[PDB]
Amino acid sequence: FGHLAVVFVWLSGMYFHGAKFSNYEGWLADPTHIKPSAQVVWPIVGQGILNGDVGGGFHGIQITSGLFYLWRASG
Amino acid sequence: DFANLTPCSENPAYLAKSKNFLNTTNDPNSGKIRAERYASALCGPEGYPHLIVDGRFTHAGDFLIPSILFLYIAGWIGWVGRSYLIEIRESKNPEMQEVVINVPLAIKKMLGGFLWPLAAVGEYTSGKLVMKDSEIPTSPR
Amino acid sequence: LSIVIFHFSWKMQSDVWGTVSPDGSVTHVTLGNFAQSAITINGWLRDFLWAQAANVINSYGSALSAYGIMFLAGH
Amino acid sequence: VVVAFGTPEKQILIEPVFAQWIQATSGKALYGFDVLLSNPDSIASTTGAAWLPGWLDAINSGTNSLFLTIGPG
Amino acid sequence: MQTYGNDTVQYEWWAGNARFADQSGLFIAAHVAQAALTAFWAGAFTLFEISRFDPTQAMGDQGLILLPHLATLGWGVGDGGQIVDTYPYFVIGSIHLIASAVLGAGALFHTLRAPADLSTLKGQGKKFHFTWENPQQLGIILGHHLLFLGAGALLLAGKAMYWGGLYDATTQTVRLVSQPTLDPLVIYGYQTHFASISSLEDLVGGHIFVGFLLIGGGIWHILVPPLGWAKKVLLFSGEAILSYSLGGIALAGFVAAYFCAVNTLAYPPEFYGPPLAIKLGIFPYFADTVELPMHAHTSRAWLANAHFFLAFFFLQGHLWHALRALGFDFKRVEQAFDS
Amino acid sequence: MQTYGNDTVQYEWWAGNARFADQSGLFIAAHVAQAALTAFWAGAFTLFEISRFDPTQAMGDQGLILLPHLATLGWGVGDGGQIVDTYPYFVIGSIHLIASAVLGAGALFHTLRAPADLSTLKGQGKKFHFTWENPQQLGIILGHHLLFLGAGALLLAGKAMYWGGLYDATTQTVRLVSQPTLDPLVIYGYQTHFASISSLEDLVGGHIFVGFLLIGGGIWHILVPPLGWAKKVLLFSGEAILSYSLGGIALAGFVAAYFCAVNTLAYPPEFYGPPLAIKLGIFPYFADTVELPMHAHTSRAWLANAHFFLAFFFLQGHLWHALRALGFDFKRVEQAFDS
Amino acid sequence: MDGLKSFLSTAPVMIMALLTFTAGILIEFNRFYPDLLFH
Amino acid sequence: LNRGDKVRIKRTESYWYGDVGTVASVEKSGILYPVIVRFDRVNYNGFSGSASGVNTNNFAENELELVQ
Amino acid sequence: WLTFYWHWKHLGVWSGNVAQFNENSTYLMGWFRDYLWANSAQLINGYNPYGVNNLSVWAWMFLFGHLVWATGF
Ligand code: CLA
Ligand code: CLA
Ligand code: CLA
């Protein structure tokens, strides 16, 4: 039960980053031109260069977990 | 003299690259502030600041001011770690006070570590800093 | 498993993945070098490991530079 | 990390001044230290040793690998 | 010296100067060597910066502090505020340095040959033996020192009036002053605008008025012992008299740091630099008005900003010793934080 | 303080200031050093804000909180909110900083030369000895402090009427209040619209009425001790009198944070910035109308928001010391979660 | 609650409390004052 | 040497050579090593992965230097 | 470490491109990219599907050395 609470927090973090720190609405309009991105880093010590142009003006870590493709298949 | 090190204000490699300095923080003029700050240093042929550590007080901010600021803090961490370890050694259970730190005793030692170099000289003079070789566990040679 | 994912990474890029010409022609990512170079350890060294890690070592100063950091971090 | 973060000017580049000084004490005037053999007015170069025109030509040519120019790398 | 009741305080090497505080002969030897080191710095660093002096540039921008002091007295200055003679700076820098060798010899005399305690000595050294708890002996020491400080202030008034002439920063020349002020009301009016006097004839007359006061004060302290009201309200320990001296010289340091930075008469701008703006940050500091680059700090920003910190850290040194004289053990801080 | 029946409670170092409670001599020494620290911050940060101030932009946009307090009082302003003076700012910032050193000397006097308990000595010091259980002596202290606060409120009354006059933000000038509003009906009417006060004569006239009320109440507490009903409803313990003062200073802190944000008379817009809007997110904060660039705030937006957060945590400290005075152990919160 | 204070005073928690506070100092110092290669 | 006496191990082969120990018991039975000494630091003894060693060892009179 | 240093510094000296060592040796990616990856290009092409050259034995030995080093593990 405690392990499932860890996975549910981890699952909730993926949906929260998709909700708040992602271009999922931008990606859903143009899936063939906008890259998926759901992690935005804070601008500190030069690490803001990692927020690359993933299309649509959004800047963030280009995610490879496939969550955007999962959520489009979930509706 | 550093004849192979032009200053960055008169270094043409730095002058062509300081106009394209990126912003490291949320401030949009972070690369402009870094361009003015690094101009006072000594630059090489590739327009990057080369630091001088030999002991010159013109370049004291390159290493000596980092050295003074580090050794004070690193002396502070070592001294309050040593003084906490001595104080908990006299207790009934010295073993459990390392995995379960007496936090009010730890804060008492840590705020007192700002006068560590005066306490280190005094404890070295009193003989309580350095133990004698006869009183130390020793390998069988 | 490292050979499994290396077999996966090379066979997809050489013989599956790539861009499509409008008349139906397909050119691949590594131009079909699996049939002649994945028979040899040197081809695995040169045409897979040396060639496709050019993107992780030239990634410095860009958005993929964290992958350049983490590639040295794992080394 | 700072080169990866697009800021190679933030590198800690330390000039090996102590080793560049020893190159200057053998006669290499590239670094501007006028000490011993890179100083023509010092007693180590005033004494007229017969190696000195051959040595100072070879140490300052740069086409050899005698005393290579050394930097932060 | 405060002993906290314990008669046998041993003292470590870092507090090793506290060992001779009850020894009269060794008290002379360390103080005379201090005056040897003080006159050596007045002698060697006058000769150090006369070698580094460039007569084409202004000596304020060069970073020299002792040549502007002698140039304000009126040595080596022509008709245009420049420097033409390097010899009176060399003579005074030699006279101070030879007198440091006499003082450096007399300190080694009082260390080795003279006894550690002057009560052992028979002759005139038994009269020179002072104890800290003897107020009648200390006023004789204080009164004789007030005589030489009064004679020093009259010698400066003598140097301006007769033996040469002072510098006039208004007219940019060395001017022999004649007939200074004698009314006590203008000196009493100088408590307000002390740092903006801008008058040689009132500076010398003020030095006449304090020269006659210090000599007359030294007459009173030699002839009359402490009355008893000062014994009741002031302590008479070894560290107590040092506390009053460190407090008194911190106030003199704070005045001289302020008088250097804003006054133009005794610190002329062609000798020192522009009058400093009183800035303040995480510490008070008098910053340069003209702001000469490459970390210049043109020789009045070195006098004023050193004599504030040296006055602040003597104010901290006055507080360390007055707390010690009043009876604070200073280890009771550590037992306050103990469990 | 509160002992919870344990008689001799040994406080630790983090609660080390509870040790000198029920000790009258060290009670003076900590509070005078607090007054030394408060007058130091008044003195140093007036001179700190002089060294940063430039008359190109306004004082509110710079981040200056002490100079507009003196500009509203009517010293450094020439015409229309323009700061062309800056010398009465330096006088006030030096009078306060010298008075900090006088207070800093007297704090170390009661540390060392006065005992921890004032009942030990004799002669004008046993009358100054106070115990927390004595209501007669605490009202004598309260009556004299009301007389000082009453004369301080009457000091503003003489300041506007005679000594230079207050700044009038409505006319953008400095005027002497010749006719203050000495009407008890309009002052009692200002218990509703105290925020929207715009008359300097009503501001000074309200200060006359509170400056005579505190003086009249100061005479009342000196002559008359606390009565039998005040003993029954108010606890006369060490931590209870502190908790009454912490609640009183938190209520004043909320009122002063509300006077800062919305007033234009006592806080003119050209000195502090535009008047604030009382926002509330997860806490009540006062936000600026226009957005000052580079993520900066006006000095009115810094005074009002800090004094809300100071008065909130001083209300929480009032709650901490009221429950300890009433008898709540505060280890019962641990004993409730353990049970 | 007393054993909760002991668990919060354990060696893993207090080193993660200190290193968060140390990283809290260093990130905030390099946010308002970035790019400090030298003094 | 009595029970509770503080000694320093002069036996070179031991883990506690140069360390201080406390005398727990002395056997009066003609033992070659009659003095049982207790230590505050356990030795290396035990299998790999064991969290503690043994804090007691038997010594003779010639291997102990008097400390207290 | 020292023979990587000797080889990469001398590769710049012999080619005249001393600035390639000077701008890249201060960080370990420059050693990894501009020295290890870059100079191994003609080595690993000692033999390929398109033929061989004189570096074929050195290409085989370089992989032979990888095998012996990993067999030691
Ligand atoms: C006129 C000056 C005066 C006099 C005569 C004394 C006399 C003495 N003090 Mg001192 N004191 C004063 C000023 C004075 N102090 C000031 C300036 C401070 C504040 C910092 C104090 C605070 C102080 C403390 C904290 C202590 C005393 C004590 C002592 C005694 C022995 C000190 C010793 O052995 O030093 C030996 C000298 C050294 C170990 C050298 C230390 C060097 C320091 C760290 C650096 C200072 C120089 C630095 C480079 C800056 C130079 C700037 C310059 C170039 C412009 C002796 C009675 C001690 C005591 O209570 O004994 C009874 C004691 O513990 N003093
Ligand atoms: C302005 C610099 C100055 C002056 C002039 C003195 C002067 C004095 N100090 Mg001294 N000292 C100073 C700096 C100074 N100190 C500093 C910076 C330190 C800290 C490192 C000390 C620490 C110190 C110690 C540890 C002691 C003195 C004592 C003395 C006396 C030694 C000579 C004597 O009485 O013969 C007769 C002396 C003896 C019979 C025994 C002392 C033996 C030698 C001569 C002590 C010399 C130590 C030396 C001064 C340290 C140099 C420090 C610095 C100048 C490099 C002398 C009166 C000594 C004293 O008062 O003892 C009576 C004492 O024990 N000093
Ligand atoms: C006029 C102010 C006043 C007075 C005179 C007292 C007096 C006292 N209180 Mg306190 N109290 C007050 C305000 C007051 N309190 C307020 C405002 C708070 C709310 C936070 C409290 C809450 C409080 C608690 C929780 C406790 C007391 C206790 C104490 C006693 C010892 C305090 C001590 O030694 O701590 C010395 C101080 C420290 C060790 C520092 C604590 C560290 C904090 C975090 C510092 C705050 C930093 C802050 C951000 C500073 C910046 C402010 C601003 C510029 C941003 C003493 C009787 C103790 C008690 O029960 O009595 C025995 C105790 O445990 N008080």
Ligand code: CLA
């Ligand atoms: C590249 C590195 C390498 C190589 C060559 C070996 C070799 C071997 N591993 Mg392995 N191993 C490695 C690294 C390596 N290991 C490391 C890193 C670990 C530590 C964790 C292990 C731990 C280990 C375990 C735990 C196990 C093995 C086993 C084995 C065997 C696999 C089955 C077999 O015989 O295959 C055939 C042999 C090869 C593929 C080796 C290459 C042979 C070439 C192609 C032929 C050369 C022969 C030559 C022409 C004739 C000689 C020339 C003459 C002049 C002398 C084989 C002997 C397993 C085993 O013994 O299973 C039976 C076993 O249980 N390994």
Ligand SMILES: CC1=C(/C=C/C(C)=C/C=C/C(C)=C/C=C/C=C(C)/C=C/C=C(C)/C=C/C2=C(C)CCCC2(C)C)C(C)(C)CCC1
């Ligand atoms: C007591 C004591 C001490 C102290 C001492 C001191 C520190 C002092 C110093 C002293 C000194 C420090 C002295 C002085 C001297 C000087 C000198 C020795 C110099 C020389 C020179 C001369 C003499 C000359 C010069 C010249 C001229 C003038 C002119 C020109 C030329 C010529 C250059 C030649 C001690 C601590 C150690 C120890 C203990 C005891």
